[PDB]
């Protein structure tokens, strides 16, 4: 029941930092490394994420990994930076420069050997690993290229372990770089073959959440990272805590991956109510269900109405009646059977833990393999081919040591990956 985490790039480092400082708060871990919790269920499975030391300190089983050293300096300057293991801060001298190859082929390849060394050193100390978690962004240069290099490298030595990849993938309205298309098209297929299932986060859905769902006039990246870390922590809730109807990452994979290549998911979380609406809203799983399935409450910039859900799962946390929660999942199933796929009965999945996050009597993490990822992948592929037709910005890769053939192959990889979703969504019995 052990998972070891890795953060790649600036985005990965920040998101993993926030995830670590929320999971340590959940487990009652001092920023200095000691224990200040009041409950025993935390210490029962604290070993899943924190490695105990001879001195009684619980250091995160995390590998911080970024070519830029400024991100390492910032994460150490953070309030929970001293918690992290010092020799896990593997960093280069020159940044990747928003390039695929500068993190995946030439500079990352030299750096990645020490990362594999330290990662397997952490792995061996565990009795047995459930698997490897990665947090990165295909939008970033080193977050995408070098993270995908690690993705490829772990498979050849850990074939039958879960690979939980949390990527942060962009959209043009909040596109902060002009190399988003290249950096995601060259990255998608590494996730395709070399990850058992990847759960994706969109930048713009998070801003939509903060503006419309939570009514925040000043949400920052720190504000966004906790919302992402909510799912980051709720995915492993059954791992870390006892459950009335427990589950795990292998449970989620086997229950949400009917066919091997359909393993890209969209995320949802609950509850998400603004403080003003928090007063007048009764915190119950009954309302948490429409918070689960609501369009603007989603963590992906793809409207569920356009797509059709293949398989979805729900991780409930708290003290709720499994009776009522199961009948609610049935109710949403038969209320919108058109949205779900007909030839798989009970497309929604129930999993019930006991421990909810801090202060929340009840919480929900939603996982969904909706076909609406078709829109997002098709549109980003169109963005790619728009400049790929003109041989523009491609000189960086060609000079750095990359060929045209793999470019064409990756474009074909999205083409025949995204071609699946419409022909599974329009299928008839």
């Amino acid at each position: 029941r052990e998972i070891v985490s890795c953060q790649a790039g600036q985005c990965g480092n920040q998101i993993g930092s926030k995830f670590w400082e929320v999971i340590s708060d959940e487990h009652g871990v001092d920023p200095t490394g000691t224990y200040q919790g009041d409950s025993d269920l935390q210490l029962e499975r604290i070993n899943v994420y924190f490695d105990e030391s001879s001195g009684g300190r619980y250091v995160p089983r995390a590998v911080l990994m970024d070519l830029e050293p400024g991100t390492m300096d910032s994460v150490r300057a953070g309030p929970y930076g001293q918690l992290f293991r010092p020799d896990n801060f593997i960093f280069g001298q020159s940044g990747a420069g928003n390039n695929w190859a500068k993190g995946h082929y030439t500079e990352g390849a030299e750096l990645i050997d020490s990362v594999l060394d330290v990662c397997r050193k952490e792995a061996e100390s565990c009795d047995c690993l459930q698997g490897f978690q990665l947090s990165h962004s295909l939008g970033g240069g080193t977050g995408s290229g070098m993270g995908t290099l690690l993705i490829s490298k772990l498979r050849e030595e850990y074939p039958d372990r879960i690979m939980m990849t949390f990527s942060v993938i962009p959209s043009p309205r909040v596109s902060d770089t002009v190399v988003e298309p290249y950096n995601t098209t060259l990255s998608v297929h590494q996730l395709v073959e070399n990850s058992d299932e990847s759960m994706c986060i969109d930048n713009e859905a998070l801003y939509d959440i903060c503006f419309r769902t939570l009514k925040l006039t000043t949400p920052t990246f720190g504000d966004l990272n906790h919302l992402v870390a909510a799912v980051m922590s709720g995915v492993t809730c059954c791992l870390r805590f006892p459950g009335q109807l427990n589950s795990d990452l292998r449970k989620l994979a086997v229950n949400l991956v009917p066919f091997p290549r359909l393993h890209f998911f969209m995320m949802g979380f609950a509850p998400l109510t603004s403080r003003g609406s928090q007063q007048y809203r009764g915190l119950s799983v009954a309302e948490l269900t429409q918070q689960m399935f609501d369009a603007k409450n989603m963590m992906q910039a793809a409207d569920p109405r356009h797509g059709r859900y293949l398989t979805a799962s729900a991780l409930f946390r708290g003290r709720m009646s499994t009776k009522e929660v199961d009948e609610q999942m049935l109710n949403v199933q038969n209320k919108n059977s058109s949205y779900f796929i007909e030839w798989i009965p009970n497309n929604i999945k129930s999993s019930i833990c006991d421990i909810p996050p801090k202060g929340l009597k009840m919480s929900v993490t939603f996982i969904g393999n909706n076909t609406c990822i078709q829109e997002m992948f098709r549109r980003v592929g169109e963005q790619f081919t728009g400049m790929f037709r003109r041989k523009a910005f491609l000189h960086w890769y060609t000079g750095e040591g990359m060929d045209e053939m793999e470019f064409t192959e990756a474009e074909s990889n999205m083409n025949d990956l995204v071609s699946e979703y419409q022909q599974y969504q329009d299928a008839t019995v």
């Binding site: 009652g28 009041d38 409950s39 269920l41 009335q244 003290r319 006991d354 421990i355 801090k358 009597k361």
Partner: peptide, 19 residues
């Protein structure tokens, strides 16, 4: 006012049953 569920109340439903 804001209410926070404490970690003291944290317990499994099996423990609640055997209580």
């Amino acid at each position: 006012t804001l209410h926070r569920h404490p970690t003291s109340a944290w317990e499994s439903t099996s423990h609640a049953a055997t209580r």
